[PDB]
Amino acid sequence: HHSKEELLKLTETVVTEYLNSGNANEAVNGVREMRAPKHFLPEMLSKVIILSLDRSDEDKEKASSLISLLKQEGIATSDNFMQAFLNVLDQCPKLEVDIPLVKSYLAQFAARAIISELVSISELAQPLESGTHFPLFLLCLQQLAKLQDREWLTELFQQSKVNMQKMLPEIDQNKDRMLEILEGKGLSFLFPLLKLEKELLKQIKLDPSPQTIYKWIKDNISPKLHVDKGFVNILMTSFLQYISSEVNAPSKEQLEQEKQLLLSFKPVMQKFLHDHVDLQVSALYALQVHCYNSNFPKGMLLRFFVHFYDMEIIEEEAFLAWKEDITQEFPGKGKALFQVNQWLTWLETA
């Protein structure tokens, strides 16, 4: 016959003493002596969170530890934590009035609960989709990275299968805006190829020295992504965009400049492409799309094929594999094949 207010008052005492002593044994004892009904469990947990919110970072850590302990002891469940967490989230506007940093603080609780296996990233994404509470979801990610590491967070985020763009407010739901927001939260590391796509051409223009470009890639892209087909697409596309922006049937002078520019970038291209037929195919697709965007100017695609072959950027087998590859992810394959088919036949038959 115990009321809601009695049990909340009892909860408050347990919290005050745990924050003082860090008594795992006595906190559990306190909660057990409460003999709280199962229906009060979520209310108890949300009280634990709210009592701690406007206290120190250290007291917040202690409150999260208490929650985890109650689950470990079978006093409450992951489901009870989720109920409780959602109940606090719903009060976010009210709490923010008196606790201006409440979102950042709530993000601390979410991060620690995920770490202790009380809630998943994929679950957390559900009530937060489309920028609910926003930037709360991103602040949870911030805290995860800080408490663990970027490699851990990157793979957990990958495992969650959450679509990051879908987590943004609707008016922000665009790849370019997404990158702006993530960079501002210190979360750019989650989308390195998107960041590459937006920055690489700018970087080449800034300092086109082959050594600088290579070192920039080494610094900003993982060795594993160096062998990723998407990376190669962006790499090649960026070089080609640079070349054509500087060089523009063309004059003898334009053709020579174009060749000299390629000759300067060749060692960088070779460093990533050598001994990777699949990547060399992806590089040909990048070339295909590049020429496609200029309506396949007379002889352009073919002259680049010839350069790629002669400069040992692309080996014979990749040219033939490109022709055979069935992808329709890239426009202009039929028009592309029309231009280069005789040259390819020549490689095979002459």
UniProtKB/Swiss-Prot annotation:
Top-level taxon: Eukaryota
GO MF entry, a single one: translation initiation factor activity
Glycyl lysine isopeptide (Lys-Gly) (interchain with G-Cter in SUMO2) crosslink residues: K38
Cystines in this chain: none
W2 domain span: 183-350
PTM entry text: Phosphorylation; hyperphosphorylated during mitosis.
Domain MI stretches: 6-129
UniProtKB keywords: Acetylation, Initiation factor, Isopeptide bond, Methylation, Phosphoprotein, Protein biosynthesis, Repressor, Translation regulation, Ubl conjugation
GO BP of this protein: cell death; negative regulation of autophagy; positive regulation of cell growth; regulation of cell cycle; regulation of translational initiation; translational initiation
Presence of the UniProt keyword Acetylation in the record: yes
Tissue expression as described in the entry: Ubiquitously expressed in all adult tissues examined, with high levels in skeletal muscle and heart. Also expressed in fetal brain, lung, liver and kidney.
A GO term from the CC aspect: cytosol
Record's miscellaneous remark: This gene has been shown to be extensively edited in the liver of APOBEC1 transgenic animal model. Its aberrant editing could contribute to the potent oncogenesis induced by overexpression of APOBEC1. The aberrant edited sequence, called NAT1, is likely to be a fundamental translational repressor.
Quaternary structure note: Interacts with the serine/threonine protein kinases MKNK1 and MKNK2. Binds EIF4A and EIF3. Interacts with MIF4GD. Interacts with DAZAP2.
Function comment: Appears to play a role in the switch from cap-dependent to IRES-mediated translation during mitosis, apoptosis and viral infection. Cleaved by some caspases and viral proteases.
Family of this protein: Belongs to the eukaryotic initiation factor 4G family.
Protein's name according to its UniProt entry: Eukaryotic translation initiation factor 4 gamma 2
Full protein stretch here: 540 to 897 of 907
